[PDB]
Design a protein around this nucleic acid. Sequence first.
DNA 1: GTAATTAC
DNA 2: GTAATTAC
Length: 56
Amino acid sequence: KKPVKVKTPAGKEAELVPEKVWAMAPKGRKGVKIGLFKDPETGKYFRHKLPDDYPI
DNA sequence: GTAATTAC
DNA sequence: GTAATTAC
């Protein structure tokens, strides 16, 4: 639910709340966290790395 | 190559 | 079915 600074497919930076988040690694095993985002301007979906202590 | 996830 | 998301 924490907003994140991401670059959109339109090439603008924005502070968005990811629609869905997860860590890319087996459950309990640690890896990079990824968010699914949606661009308010283009409507396009995109993914972006999340900050490491991001609440999953 | 692949981890997890999913829009397309 | 594929590529997008980073990092190993």
